[PDB]
Design an enzyme around this catalytic site. Sequence first.
Site, PDB file in Angstrom:
ATOM      1  N   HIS A  64       6.829  -0.697  -7.251  1.00  0.00           N
ATOM      2  CA  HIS A  64       7.477  -0.423  -5.941  1.00  0.00           C
ATOM      3  C   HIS A  64       7.897  -1.923  -5.560  1.00  0.00           C
ATOM      4  O   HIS A  64       8.837  -2.119  -4.607  1.00  0.00           O
ATOM      5  CB  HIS A  64       6.465  -0.091  -5.069  1.00  0.00           C
ATOM      6  CG  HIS A  64       5.955   1.418  -5.189  1.00  0.00           C
ATOM      7  ND1 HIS A  64       4.470   1.630  -5.316  1.00  0.00           N
ATOM      8  CD2 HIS A  64       6.500   2.635  -5.512  1.00  0.00           C
ATOM      9  CE1 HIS A  64       4.634   3.195  -5.487  1.00  0.00           C
ATOM     10  NE2 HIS A  64       5.638   3.548  -5.812  1.00  0.00           N
TER      11      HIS A  64
ATOM     12  N   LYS B 255      -2.511  16.095   4.523  1.00  0.00           N
ATOM     13  CA  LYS B 255      -2.992  15.984   3.341  1.00  0.00           C
ATOM     14  C   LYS B 255      -3.567  14.234   3.272  1.00  0.00           C
ATOM     15  O   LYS B 255      -2.447  13.780   3.507  1.00  0.00           O
ATOM     16  CB  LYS B 255      -2.507  16.373   2.044  1.00  0.00           C
ATOM     17  CG  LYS B 255      -0.869  15.856   1.958  1.00  0.00           C
TER      18      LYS B 255
ATOM     19  N   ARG C  15      11.536   5.112 -12.223  1.00  0.00           N
ATOM     20  CA  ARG C  15      10.612   4.594 -13.441  1.00  0.00           C
ATOM     21  C   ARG C  15      10.421   5.896 -14.741  1.00  0.00           C
ATOM     22  O   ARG C  15      11.014   7.144 -14.265  1.00  0.00           O
ATOM     23  CB  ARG C  15       9.130   4.605 -12.746  1.00  0.00           C
ATOM     24  CG  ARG C  15       8.670   5.799 -12.064  1.00  0.00           C
ATOM     25  CD  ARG C  15       7.166   5.672 -11.660  1.00  0.00           C
ATOM     26  NE  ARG C  15       6.600   6.747 -10.971  1.00  0.00           N
ATOM     27  CZ  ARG C  15       6.464   8.081 -11.360  1.00  0.00           C
ATOM     28  NH1 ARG C  15       6.556   8.278 -12.649  1.00  0.00           N
ATOM     29  NH2 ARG C  15       6.108   8.791 -10.406  1.00  0.00           N
TER      30      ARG C  15
ATOM     31  N   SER D  44       1.571   5.484  -8.684  1.00  0.00           N
ATOM     32  CA  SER D  44       0.403   5.409  -7.897  1.00  0.00           C
ATOM     33  C   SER D  44      -0.601   6.331  -8.316  1.00  0.00           C
ATOM     34  O   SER D  44      -1.616   6.228  -8.594  1.00  0.00           O
ATOM     35  CB  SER D  44       0.755   5.912  -6.230  1.00  0.00           C
ATOM     36  OG  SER D  44       1.656   4.819  -5.980  1.00  0.00           O
TER      37      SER D  44
END
Lengths: 154, 155, 154, 157, 155, 157
Positions: free
Chosen positions: D17, D41, D90, D127
């Site tokens: 990132h 969430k 990515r 992540s």
Amino acid sequence: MTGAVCPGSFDPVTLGHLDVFERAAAQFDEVIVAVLINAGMFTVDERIEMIRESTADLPNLRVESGQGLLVDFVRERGLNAIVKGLRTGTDFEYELQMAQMNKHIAGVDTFFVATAPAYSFVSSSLAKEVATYGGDVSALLPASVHQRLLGKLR
Amino acid sequence: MTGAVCPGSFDPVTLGHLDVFERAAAQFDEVIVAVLINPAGMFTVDERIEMIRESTADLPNLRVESGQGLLVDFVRERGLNAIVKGLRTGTDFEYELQMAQMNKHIAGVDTFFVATAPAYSFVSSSLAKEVATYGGDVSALLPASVHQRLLGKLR
Amino acid sequence: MTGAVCPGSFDPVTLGHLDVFERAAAQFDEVIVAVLINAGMFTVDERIEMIRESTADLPNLRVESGQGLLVDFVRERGLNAIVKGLRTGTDFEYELQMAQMNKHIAGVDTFFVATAPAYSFVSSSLAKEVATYGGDVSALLPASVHQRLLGKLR
Amino acid sequence: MTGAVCPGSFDPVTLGHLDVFERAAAQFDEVIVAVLINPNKAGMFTVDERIEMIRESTADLPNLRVESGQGLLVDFVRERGLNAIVKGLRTGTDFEYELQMAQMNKHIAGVDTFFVATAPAYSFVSSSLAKEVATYGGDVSALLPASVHQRLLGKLR
Amino acid sequence: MTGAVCPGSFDPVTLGHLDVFERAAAQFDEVIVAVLINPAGMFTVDERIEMIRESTADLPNLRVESGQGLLVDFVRERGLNAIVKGLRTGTDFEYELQMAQMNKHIAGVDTFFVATAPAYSFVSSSLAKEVATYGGDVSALLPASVHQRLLGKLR
Amino acid sequence: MTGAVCPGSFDPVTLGHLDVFERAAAQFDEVIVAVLINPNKAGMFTVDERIEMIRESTADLPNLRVESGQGLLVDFVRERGLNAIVKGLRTGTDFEYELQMAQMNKHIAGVDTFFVATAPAYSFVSSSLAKEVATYGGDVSALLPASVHQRLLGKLR
Ligand SMILES: O=C(O)CCn1ccc2ccccc21
Ligand SMILES: O=C(O)CCn1ccc2ccccc21
Ligand SMILES: O=C(O)CCn1ccc2ccccc21
Ligand SMILES: O=C(O)CCn1ccc2ccccc21
């Protein structure tokens, strides 16, 4: 005596789906739209109504609900062809896996057709998501569908 | 002395998996099939191990063990540093590549991919269970003993 | 009155091609195999003969040569559907580009079908290459074709 | 007056990132990092923790700022007088989904999306995979900024 | 002051290319379209430049220049270090990624990709020429001036 | 007695190739690098030059040897009493073609093909792109072994 089944959840039906229905209906004598059932936004009957409303100009197409194996749905109606649309975001590798399985277990062929570029980035899920947050998807759905979607949100 | 680990949930083992097991056992001195226990499926871990052992009886240099946690720890704990993974139709190859590069980075473990035979390229554990549940015949896609046990769970 | 065109260079026709021909012929009333011409291994007539020999059991399929725009070949025969096979190594992105172009310029639909797993790694080029260096491709080609290929090499 | 928005959940931000942030800041007059939150969430990190970790590892980029939001990305972009998104690629990116969303975003709001490939060294971190590996003890220290790594270990313990 | 280079052979420029040019000019202070001369095509470099200028008359911060050799040298020579490339149906994206990473490595130049509009997603210079040659109508896919000149070359 | 063949044109060998050689040599008892030659098209380097450049950059791998050949790869493999191929994947690999060739090679000769992803740092180099960039003066020194780089510049000048 040719025919194909066009399967999906169609929650709701989009112009992307409708494009594929129209092409199937133009190339096979008989088309059945198979509405998969199991918890989405529209009930099965609502989804069926919306497709029927949008396909009124297609005399050789009918709409029916189903569950269980798609190949059973197809074979029980005397057919052995599936027509499935491709759009941007289609999991094509999975569609190929299912096509080969369906041919293996029941001798049913699957024909894939790319939807029109204009309707290539719409999916039922993305249209619901965008409309939910107030974005305008009226160019991407049949007129009837669009009004009823606004109805479930407001 | 060479060796590799073949990881998966194998719920249940398919002929696609077996094809890969056979090719690994033919090319490495030792193979360990790692049955990875998760937060869950149709067969228990012991049942899965048993089905794999039945299917690999002719492979003396292959053994089957359960595992959990980090795959690269399972591999290194057994003195190896290679993973052999199969490819089929519907494999998320981009994710497999990501994980292989991650696994090399964090532990120095290599990953070798092999495509399963075309005959077994559209079978997966999940699709086989789904089809069988609704009465589709997947007996040409699973070891004989496995298909017998699948009928049992469904009946 | 349904129909589709199955296009290719077929130099030579493989069991992969034949699988697709058989499926098209099973799902459309009329199939035309379109043999593209322009310098390969077999002449156009040879390619046509080999396909005719391998499709003798398909009464509603015929074989013709063509050049120029495929959509013209299709439309000049009163049809507006193409059936194209997918195999391992198919440049699908290019096929999609051509499908969208062909729909745009002439309103012709393209239906894609995956060939059987057993025939999914054969192509005309790879079969010729392997056979050239002495590899056995007899399981991958129609019996007639295989004998004639051995004929052009030896 | 050029500008772009770099959107994500950043739970936590990774070096992949940060590579994209730096390239965007080098090529546009202003960059806003949009920390997009699903109010239904919770992630691992709260919005303030996410923003803090991004700010600490972007202190050298004077034309970059960090703000949270929710709902339609194109509204976040337009309400700031911009109409460009910059998004990284990515290994493991669902690029077909990204293309679908970019075409939809252009359709509904006229916003453009520019994709850039992250550096090879940072191309396999995400992540979610970083969290998963760290959960089971794997060493991801070289893939996350210092502002993140020990905060991650803290959450896990 | 920001800027990017939009490279290609543009033989001829399409509405797909133009869509990308417009988006770049809207987002960067300066855009240079680099018409890359090769070992060859239908239009001369001067003709290609002229067709692009006609099509981009409304874009004051975009200019058109010819170039050859290393793209990253063309970019850096003009004091920039960004490339904007479009994506369409049939783009070899894997090759574009390879080249972008190579270009970043050898010269520090960034590459930004943008998908062209769905309407223009299946047009390419090569396919447009091929179709037009055999009498297909590609006029909805090219700028008006370009289509006029294409007819001329073919007649 | 395990073994694998690592095939290619290696015109010239790159650090991406060498990464794959090293992984193969770490995992099989013997590795043979197969320098496959088309007798109908010369490359930049002759067969002896190619072999020399590979040997110089693999001197630390005692279980690896280098041999040239032509015709069917599966014949090269089988005539050495082996039946495994190890092939690298990089950015820009035509993986669908590789899968087609692997299935064909298994069909005609029973030879298995194992694919391994090259290291991220070496993932965008190929022999052809390295040659092309070097031709126009770009710096590819970090992507090729020392045994190659100045020999390449020599060919180009
Ligand atoms: O993909 C196949 O069919 C078998 C190849 N293979 C080897 C290990 C493994 C784990 C999960 C899924 C497939 C696996
Ligand atoms: O992490 C990467 O490699 C991709 C770089 N990137 C840039 C913005 C963004 C948002 C969500 C996920 C990844 C993102
Ligand atoms: O792909 C498009 O349609 C236009 C986007 N684009 C921008 C530069 C360029 C060069 C070659 C091909 C396409 C290009
Ligand atoms: O260079 C790479 O990244 C791929 C690694 N690799 C290994 C064997 C081989 C043969 C031809 C081309 C590339 C090859």
